[PDB]
């Protein structure tokens, strides 16, 4: 009988230990989820920006192609003015 | 008392499994934290250069604007030189 309840004082302590640990596995399965959620949202955002960025990169490449054309047009135009001047020159010359 | 000792053993096995789960959950949290740190460092690397690129772009735009202006003046000066040529012939 002193045997028994002395024995019980251990069972109850073990139950108390289990409750703590269990509430623990409660608080963590509720975090790991939070950590995962915050990953999801983060990865999603990275992709909107990623898609946003590719779109801006594509626009850039188009403008550069136009600038390269202009780069050629001004060169040709300049050249035309130089030829035009040579003639005016020759007109005054002997 | 044998039955009670057996129950104590079952309880100890139950508590150990819980502790093991806690350990596993802790490791997962640590892994998540490691992922968060790598993700933040990467964002920082991406961010600082992105800003570097943004400043270079702004600088080029500033020169292109001078050029819009430079070409306009030149074109006008040419239009003016032709008016004078027309007048030379009338
Ligand atoms: Dy592309
Ligand atoms: Dy070119
Ligand atoms: Dy052309
Ligand atoms: Dy020539
Ligand atoms: Dy402008
Ligand atoms: Dy200027
Ligand atoms: Dy005029
Ligand atoms: Pt001329
Ligand atoms: Pt002329």
Swiss-Prot record, chain B:
Domain of life (superkingdom): Eukaryota
Subcellular location: Endoplasmic reticulum membrane
Complex formation: Interacts with SHE2 and MYO4.
Family: Belongs to the SHE3 family.
Note: Present with 1010 molecules/cell in log phase SD medium.
Function: RNA-binding protein that binds specific mRNAs including the ASH1 mRNA, coding for a repressor of the HO endonuclease. Part of the mRNA localization machinery that restricts accumulation of certain proteins to the bud and in the daughter cell. Required for the delivery of cortical endoplasmic reticulum into the emerging bud.
Protein name as catalogued: SWI5-dependent HO expression protein 3
Record gene name: SHE3
